[PDB]
A = this chain, B = another copy of it.
Amino acid sequence: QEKRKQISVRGLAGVENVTELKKNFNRHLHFTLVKDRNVATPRDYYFALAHTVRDHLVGRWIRTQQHYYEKDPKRIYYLSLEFYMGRTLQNTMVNLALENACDEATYQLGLDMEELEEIEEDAGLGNGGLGRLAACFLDSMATLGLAAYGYGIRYEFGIFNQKICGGWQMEEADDWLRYGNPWEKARPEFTLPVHFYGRVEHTSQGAKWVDTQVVLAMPYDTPVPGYRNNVVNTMRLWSAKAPNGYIQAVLDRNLAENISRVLYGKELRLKQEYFVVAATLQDIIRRFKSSKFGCRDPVRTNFDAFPDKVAIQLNDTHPSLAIPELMRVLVDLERLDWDKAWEVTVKTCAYTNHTVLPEALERWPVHLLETLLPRHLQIIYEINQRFLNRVAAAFPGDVDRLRRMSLVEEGAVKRINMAHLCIAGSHAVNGVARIHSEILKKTIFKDFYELEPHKFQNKTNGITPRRWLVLCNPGLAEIIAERIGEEYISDLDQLRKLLSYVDDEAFIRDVAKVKQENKLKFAAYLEREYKVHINPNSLFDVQVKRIHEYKRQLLNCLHVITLYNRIKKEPNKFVVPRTVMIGGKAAPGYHMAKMIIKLITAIGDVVNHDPVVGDRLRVIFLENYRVSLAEKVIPAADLSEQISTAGTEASGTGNMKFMLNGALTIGTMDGANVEMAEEAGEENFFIFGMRVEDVDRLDQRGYNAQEYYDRIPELRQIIEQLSSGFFSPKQPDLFKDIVNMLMHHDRFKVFADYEEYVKCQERVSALYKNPREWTRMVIRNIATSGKFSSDRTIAQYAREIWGVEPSRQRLPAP
């Protein structure tokens, strides 16, 4: 029966117009959601619109996936334990070019689309930079036409929502799924077993992994759209499920399931890591084998073509177990011999390093691996012996480096170094900015570099101009499009054409006008949430990193208090009004970080209620900072704070976001700030403080905070205020911990950059006075931000690591 060539997407799309969209929106409210207008809540109207947009998303998805099965390209598998997706609705509409049509449709139906947008929960799937880089990458990979996949874990509670109670961080569950996720599709049909524990039985045949405990992995598909090229790739997230003496099988059921429950560590983190690797790989091998278009059968069983058809990117060491897992499947199940299987593994795998210092590098005790992944241990020991023989022959009689490069690390209880596992198992290893990729070959991994120099590359991070310009900042996208068109949205380097407009009067005030417009929008939100009062004409001074000593929101605080003391000593002096905003989540259990949050709010209570200060200084702690808040605050920011101690940041990614939206930057010569300053010119940045070589020199002679205390009176004053209980009148000794750390054991040298930080902030105040000059510097920043598009990043990953050609040409259509 060829009658079923009539089972097709052919003309299910419809015309994508106002007429068809509202008929569709009505289908979904009533037939999908089983509601009517009598009962429907705003959330229902959101779900009905989501499904209406989704029909058009999956139409193109079916087409893209078909195209892959008939073209048979190299498929690229992006592995991550964090996908920081944010909201989906507006993004799907801009990328499909449906925003105009939907806005009008919902309008004609009595609905307001901005309301409905604000109802969508942030996807509880990521935590910080690691996770948003993944999301930006997904969006760029689809825009550049790559057959790409995001594979991760579907977390049922993400990482906690942050609420501030009495100035203290409290954590609350993030049940972002409680009403369901319309963007996902459960696939009960593709449930796969993931094995734990057991023992290895040595048949003189192969090696069998027997007696194991089983956990079921069930996949959820979410489609991800390219920017107006009709390609729509897959994000595929695994959910843990249990199968069905004593009924302690209850414990086994509960323990199986909390693999999907939360982010962050015992067995659980390692359980989570194997889980994602083992399910993803079964999916990988399956597609490799069943490659003939229209044909479900496993037609291709020769693995010599595996590295030509599959690429696996290991985002940090979290998915590292992919290496020995791939080895397990090829040797044990597929019965290829060792050398042949290893060559395949190495050619398939690639590793990205994100972290800066040898101690954050992931390690697992042997006894743990031995108990839970006994076969994987053997495979790791085996990889290790042959890698160390390869080292032996390349560097004879060198016993020291031999044990320096070993995957097995000695001490009190042997640990296995997963970063060493990654380097040996992959054809490429990259760092995430230029300086970071350099210290990787200089220090952290020099022994490996000397063995295989070719392996080591750089790939500077980036940001999608979709979400981080066109979506969150329509005003700025617009005024740019009037001078140069909209080619820049998928080719950011074209922003340089804006350098022709540094001296155009109309453009300078249009940039100023858009900033002011975003400030007003955000200010209004900041009143109906924090119920204070923001001066929309003040300088919006923003710092939004995660709370942490090395990120130095304590250095910002000192500046805020310096500003407060000056205003109060001379209340008649003219001052540039400032709204300082600090946002970010503190890790539970990290006590100092919870203190830093309380300090920020404590200062707020004083400065926001001093009659003398008026509206010249406002301090706000931004609650529950996340992707959607970042979309609202980054556009409205004037000053971006990147003030980590030099030598501690690899990249940074939020800085790029600020640069794009017309904030000037105050930052240290560290991470992504270096290359940003390079692109823009030093004079268009506000760099201050010690460089990395200044840090080392201070370390070498010994850091004493007391030296700075003794010679800077304005600094002494603040400490005496923190000491005496000025900022916590009820509990005078509240900030005792902070003070004693600042004075006696500060690993991150806050006092040492204090002086230059405040002089710098003064130079920042002076520029702010002259809005023409201020804006012209902003234009120079914006015109010069093209490099930090993730379209540029993924194009490099594609050509230098993956061996696939980026392509901006359209896939046909449904």
Contacts and interface: CB of A to CB of B under 8 A. Distances in A.
A254 B244 contact: no
A3 B110 contact: yes
Contacts of A55: 27, 31
A479 B2 CA distance: 35
Nearest to A3: B110
A264 B250 CA distance: 20
Interface in A38-91: 38-41, 43, 54-55, 58-59, 61-62, 66, 69
B179 A110 contact: no
A188 B182 CA distance: 13
Interface string A312-343: 00000000000000000000000000000000
Interface string A1-29: 11111111110100000000011001101
Contact of A180 (B9, B10, B26, B188): B188
Nearest to A187: B34
Contact of A38 (B2, B29, B294): B294
Contacts of A27: 12, 55
Contacts of A36: 7-9, 62, 66
B3 A108 contact: yes
A506 interface: no
A413 interface: no
Contacts of A188: 178-180
Question: How many chain copies does the complex carry?
Answer: 2
A30 interface: yes
A41 B188 CA distance: 13
Contacts of A29: 7
A36 B29 CA distance: 24
Contacts of A175: 244
Interface string A90-112: 00000000000000000011110
Most buried by B among A26, A111, A185: A26
Given A179-B188, A189-B179, A250 B254 contact: yes
Nearest to A178: B188
Interface residues of A, number: 60
Interface string A103-123: 000001111000000000000
Nearest to A110: B3
Nearest to A223: B34
A573 interface: no
Most buried by B among A39, A69, A175: A39
Nearest to A177: B188
A157 interface: yes
A37 B253 CA distance: 36
Contacts of A37: 4-5, 7-8
A165 interface: no
A59 B30 contact: yes
Given A7-B29, A109-B6, A296 B38 contact: yes
A26 B59 CA distance: 11
Interface in A129-162: 157
A1 to B, nearest CB: 4
Interface string A614-638: 0000000000000000000000000
Given A66-B38, A186-B180, A109 B4 contact: yes
A725 to B, nearest CB: 33
A251 interface: yes
A767 to B, nearest CB: 46
Contacts of A254: 247, 250, 253-254
A491 interface: no
A23 B13 CA distance: 11
Contacts of A110: 1-4, 6-7
A18 to B, nearest CB: 12
A549 interface: no
B6 A30 contact: no
A94 to B, nearest CB: 21
A614 to B, nearest CB: 41
Given A34-B221, A179-B188, 16 more contacts: A2-B110, A4-B109, A4-B110, A4-B111, A6-B108, A6-B109, A6-B110, A8-B36, A12-B23, A27-B55, A34-B58, A38-B293, A38-B296, A41-B189, A180-B186, A250-B250
Top-10 shortest CB links A-B: A3-B110, A4-B110, A1-B110, A7-B37, A34-B185, A31-B55, A250-B254, A179-B188, A9-B30, A36-B62
15 contacts: A3-B108, A6-B22, A6-B26, A6-B109, A9-B30, A9-B36, A10-B26, A12-B31, A30-B62, A34-B61, A34-B185, A36-B66, A38-B295, A175-B244, A180-B188
